[PDB]
Amino acid sequence: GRMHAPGKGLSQSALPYRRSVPTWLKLTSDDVKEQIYKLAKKGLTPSQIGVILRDSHGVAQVRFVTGNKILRILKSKGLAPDLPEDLYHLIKKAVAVRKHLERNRKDKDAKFRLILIESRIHRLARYYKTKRVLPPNWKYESSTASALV
Amino acid sequence: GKCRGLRTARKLRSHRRDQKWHDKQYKKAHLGTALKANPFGGASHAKGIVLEKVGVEAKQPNSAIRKCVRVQLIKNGKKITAFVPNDGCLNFIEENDEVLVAGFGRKGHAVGDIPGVRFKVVKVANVSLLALYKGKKERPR
């Protein structure tokens, strides 16, 4: 179930058994990489890049075509964000709820949700510091959270 | 449920050690408060001086007068009421003499219809109550 909710959902993608490039894909690996670079230059996260490639151009999985994941490709050329995208979005949500709570001090549900969001941020940041994705002294603070977003 | 892990030995040991204090016998035998409250002080028997003879009424379901003696122990000076077991045996006991008194058989608990009595007289004047009862010995002059 969810880490911070009582829900137990089964919604997630079901990757097909075949790991091959589809027959309809006339796009070679290098064109896919170039489109990935262009989409990243437009200011899009790897999730958005994958969504656009799956939706408009038609790419079942970038890994099955280019052999590398989108974030790995971005890091290889060097276009990746300094901090990971999921951590960045969690920090963004924390900043949003903290800004809301300033003018809504009576919103005691917002305070609880902010506590849950910051717990998620701390867990993810600890994991990233374990794998050296973040500097060992990387700390999240309320007064500095909007400085990272 | 209980924890089942290869490194849970400390948790299991500490939980057992903490839960043993919720055992009545364990707490009684290891806290040491029941030992200081015991008139015998951990001893099986004790010698005392008969202060007076008392008759305690039996508990409600049956009617009788239980021939006891109020004795004062020599070791600690504590006051004790001790049952004189057989019949006529209260006549073998005189006021202000030494008696050997043992427990009543329930480890500090009152026994039978006698209320609040957990001690019984074994010897009086250094001769057993049974020898006096059976006539094997007479009271010393």
Partner: protein, 129 residues
């Protein structure tokens, strides 16, 4: 969360045998699960099984001969020496005539009789009878 996939596999097999079914679907599969099933099948308790290959973690469909009374896991996997094996068999097995304790030893995964034949102790995985 799901830890000890062997426990889930053995519980599913036991529950399907209690219900009287001829086949049970076990997922996820694992090397230890396959070895335990092979030890079971060499002794005639479980019969043939097939490993379905999905590209993440296999599933196994196990035919069920009605010969199995109970299959269980031992958690945690206690390290068992050859001198402590008899106590484990007395604790776990219905009798000295039938029933097996499955150990994992450096010589592989095998039952307690083979482990005594090869003069190896190991870690207890489970039992079946």
């Amino acid at each position: 969360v799901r830890m000890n996939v062997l426990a889930d596999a053995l519980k599913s097999i036991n529950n399907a045998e209690k219900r009287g079914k001829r086949q049970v679907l076990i997922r996820p599969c694992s090397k230890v699960i396959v070895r335990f099933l092979t030890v079971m099948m060499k002794h005639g308790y479980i019969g043939e099984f097939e490993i379905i290959d999905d590209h993440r973690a296999g599933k196994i469909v196990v035919n069920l001969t009605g010969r199995l009374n109970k299959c269980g896991v031992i958690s945690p996997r206690f390290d068992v020496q050859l001198k402590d094996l008899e106590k484990w068999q007395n604790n776990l097995l219905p009798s000295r005539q039938f029933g097996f304790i499955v150990l994992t030893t450096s010589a592989g995964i095998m039952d307690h009789e083979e482990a005594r034949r090869k003069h190896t102790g190991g870690k207890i995985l489970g039992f079946f009878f």
